[PDB]
């Protein structure tokens, strides 16, 4: 299907401790492939997926410079924002940036994104037309006007529609054996009595990729979107994901409940029953 | 590949 490439950046100011913490991660779909961390020992952008190691020294030099340049921009911006907002020097503040692009199943550009937050709240974002900005507040309006005057949207668009796409497509080819493949959920049901009259049924999905999945409980073939305990999808730690859903049922009525699992790794949706 | 353009706020 479609694919995305996303870069996530977090800068945290650290008064007295000296320099800000800077961490950048890059993803293709739900697979991390690089990282840059100011507190890591390396000082370079480094690989987090085997297929990005196909890239040569020039790629690594270039992407390392980009990470060092971005780091310095956010460090400047942390000082700048403290100034715009008239904040004191003693507290710690955070900038987050996410950017990237989506392509279709045949590599066609679908869209691009660029959004910035300060202290966990929207600051400025490139709109979908990639030709204009939305500023969340009056400080971001200072940023918006100066960015409009220098035609910053054109520069971002050139990136999002150009190298972002070129990069993503190349990663999809080089890493096709993992990125363009799926891992289906491994499933099972557990049963745990609560009392003499009720029992918990928990339907598990393990070892799946990508992260997107739908777990649904039915009773006599009817959706049970009320008495359902449902956890956030979570990383297994090996590049795959886990999720469960549970229902409290009357003891003896277990066979009436079915768990339905939908995942692109499955040729057909799965139905589980105790 | 990342975006090489840096803009101040």
């Amino acid at each position: 299907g479609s694919h995305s490439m996303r870069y996530f950046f977090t800068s945290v100011s650290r008064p007295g401790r000296g320099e800000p913490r800077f961490i950048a991660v890059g993803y293709v779909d739900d697979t991390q492939f690089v990282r840059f961390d100011s507190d890591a020992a390396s000082q370079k952008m480094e690989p987090r997926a085997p297929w990005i190691e196909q890239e040569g020294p020039e790629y690594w030099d270039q992407e390392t410079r980009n990470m060092k340049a971005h780091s310095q921009t956010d460090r400047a911006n942390l000082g700048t924002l403290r100034g715009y907002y008239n904040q004191s020097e003693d507290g710690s503040h955070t900038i987050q940036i996410m950017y990237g692009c989506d392509v279709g199943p045949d590599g066609r550009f679908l869209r691009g994104y660029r959004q910035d937050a300060y202290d966990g709240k929207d600051y400025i974002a490139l709109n979908e037309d990639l030709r204009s900005w939305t500023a969340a507040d009056m400080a971001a309006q200072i940023t918006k006007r100066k960015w409009e005057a220098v035609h910053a949207a054109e520069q971002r668009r050139v990136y999002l529609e150009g190298r972002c796409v070129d990069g993503l497509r190349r990663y999809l080819e080089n890493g096709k054996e993992t990125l363009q493949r799926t891992d289906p959920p491994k499933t099972h049901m557990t049963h745990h009595p609560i009392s003499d009259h009720e029992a918990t049924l928990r339907c598990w999905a393990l070892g799946f990729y990508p992260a997107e999945i739908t777990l649904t409980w039915q009773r006599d073939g009817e959706d049970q979107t009320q008495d359902t305990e449902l956890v956030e999808t979570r990383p297994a730690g090996d590049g795959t994901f886990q999720k469960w859903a549970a229902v409290v049922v009357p003891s003896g009525e277990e066979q009436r409940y079915t768990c339905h699992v939908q995942h692109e790794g499955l040729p057909k949706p799965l139905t589980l029953r105790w | 590949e990342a975006d090489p353009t840096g803009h101040s706020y």
Partner: antibody, heavy 122, light 109 residues
Framework: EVQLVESGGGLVQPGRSLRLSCAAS????????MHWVRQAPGKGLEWVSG????????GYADSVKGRFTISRDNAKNSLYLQMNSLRAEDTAVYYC???????????????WGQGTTVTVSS | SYVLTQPPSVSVAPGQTARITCGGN??????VHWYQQKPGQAPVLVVY???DRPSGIPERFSGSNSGNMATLTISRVEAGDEADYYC???????????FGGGTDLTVLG
């Protein structure tokens, strides 16, 4: 080791143009922001313009906007200042200076050249 | 226009700690740099980001910055330190680098 060698300075009639050049050596030129800073006779320093490492961002002092243009050739390790519509008050020693980081904003000037003199005179 | 104010002259005795001040509205929220320009010479960066020293600059050059005042401090001042010193900040609201007017440091005697 590190050198920033300015050239192109001279006498220019007001209203005309002059191009200053700065030859950079002994460092990775394209890793750093670069700037022009000037000093009129007997006066203090005035930033003129800056350019980030890859030309991705550029700035100018209000005193020169619309008239001066900063540019760089990272293949030739050179920085330029095209000065148009010169005025008597542009008369100064123009210093080529290295920004201590990738960006023209925020990061101070850690290496300065010896300067080249621009005399805007009738 | 953002303004930085330096006294035009500071006079000192050798061995004292000279102090050159740089006033600015909420200058504490900015990152101060100081330059030393001796007679017949281009400027030299002596302190960056309020308090840091480039490699090669003596430990006796130090800086502070908070509120509406930044200070360059030169301990064990010697005759060689005579120069014009300029403070500087990047101002994002105006998109300008600003310099103070410069302080002429004379070492008397």
């Amino acid at each position: 080791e590190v050198q920033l060698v300015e050239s192109g300075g001279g006498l220019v009639q007001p209203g005309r143009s002059l191009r200053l050049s700065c030859a950079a050596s002994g460092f990775t030129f394209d890793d750093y922001a670069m700037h022009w800073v000037r000093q009129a006779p007997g006066k203090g320093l005035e930033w003129v313009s800056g350019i980030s490492w890859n030309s991705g961002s550029i700035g100018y002092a209000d005193s020169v906007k619309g008239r001066f243009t900063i540019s760089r050739d990272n293949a030739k390790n050179s920085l330029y200042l095209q000065m148009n519509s010169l005025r008597a008050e542009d008369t100064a020693v123009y210093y080529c200076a290295r920004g201590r980081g990738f960006h023209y904003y925020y990061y101070g000037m850690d290496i300065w050249g010896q300067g080249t003199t621009v005399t805007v005179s009738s | 226009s953002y303004v930085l104010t330096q006294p035009p002259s500071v006079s000192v005795a050798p061995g004292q700690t000279a102090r050159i001040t740089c006033g600015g509205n909420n200058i504490g929220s900015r990152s101060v740099h100081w330059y030393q320009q001796k007679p017949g010479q281009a400027p030299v960066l002596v302190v960056y980001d309020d308090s840091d020293r480039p490699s090669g600059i003596p430990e006796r050059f130090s800086g502070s910055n908070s509120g509406n005042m930044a200070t360059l401090t030169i301990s064990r001042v010697e005759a060689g330190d005579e120069a014009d010193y300029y403070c500087q900040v990047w101002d994002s609201r105006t998109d300008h680098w600003v310099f103070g007017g410069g302080t002429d440091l004379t070492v008397l005697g």
